[PDB]
Every structure is written in structure tokens, then in C-alpha cells.
Amino acid sequence: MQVFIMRHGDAALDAASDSVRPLTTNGCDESRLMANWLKGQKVEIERVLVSPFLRAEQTLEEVGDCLNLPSSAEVLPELTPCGDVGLVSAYLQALTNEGVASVLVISHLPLVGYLVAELCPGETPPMFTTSAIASVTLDESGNGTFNWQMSPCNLK
Ligand SMILES: [Ca+2]
């Protein structure tokens, strides 16, 4: 199963509280830039898992405008910045055995980094710039292979 792990776009420095911070215009542009690139890679997303924080959901919104995504997304409380990487991993292993072909995960740091290390033995947590995406190939046993990582600064 193909797992695309994405960090949300650039978010506003100020809001009433962290969970409701919106994406900046730059955050919107960089997310669409990445979405357009995934479209050129001939990528087809079957399932989408997203954090409940507004910045992750708005990133999903911007991505869905350039890339074909399923009708509904799964909002996981475990995808917040301090979510349990073990539960997210178990969730992904469940879908792999279910037969799901690909998944797009939009989350935050540091979780996004820990998730790669958790899924791919021998890999230390990679750094993620906003809107950056890492591709991982996962099998029924929960073992993954870290394929590559692409970021906005690279596409530019
Ligand atoms: Ca469009």
C-alpha cells in the first residue's frame, strides 16, 4: 500500500488558539503546487486521513481542488501534533490488510517525522517543511520502505 505522508501548509502566526490557526496565502499556494505535482506523477488516492486542526483540513481543501480525492475524509484525533504514532501505524496496517491501495495522511510535526521512523525500520525521523510529502510503501506486516520526499522549495 502506498502511503503519502504530508505536513500541512504554512499557517498564520496568530489566531485565538493553535487548533484554529488558518493557512496563509503562501500555505495555500505551496499546497496546490504539491497537489499539482502529485497529479503529474499519475497518483490516485483511495483514502484520506487528516488531523482535526483547521490548518490540516484547509490543506486537504486546497489539495482536493487540484487532485481527485474521495468524497469523505477520516478525521483522526491521533493525527494532532501530539498524537500516538502507534495508533496511526495500527490504523494504516488495518487498511493495508483491508486491501486499500493508497492513502494520503495530512498531519503535523513532530508526528509526521516519527511516523516515517515507526513505519520504516532503520530510518531516523526526517525533517518536513510545510506541504512536504514523503512516500512510503507498506506491506501487510506493518514494515515499510521510505521511497522519497518532495518539498515546495524543490519544485520551485
Ligand atoms: Ca481544479
UniProtKB/Swiss-Prot annotation:
Transmembrane segments: none annotated. Keywords: Hydrolase, Protein phosphatase. It holds the Pfam family His_Phos_1. Its EC number is 3.1.3.-. GO terms for cellular component: cytoplasm. It comes from the Bacteria. GO terms for molecular function: protein histidine phosphatase activity. GO terms for biological process: protein modification process; regulation of phosphorelay signal transduction system. CDD domains: HP_PGM_like. InterPro entries: His_Pase_superF_clade-1, His_PPase_superfam, SixA. Belongs to the SixA phosphatase family. NCBIfam families: sixA (TIGR00249). Exhibits phosphohistidine phosphatase activity towards the HPt domain of the ArcB sensor involved in the multistep His-Asp phosphorelay. This is Phosphohistidine phosphatase SixA.
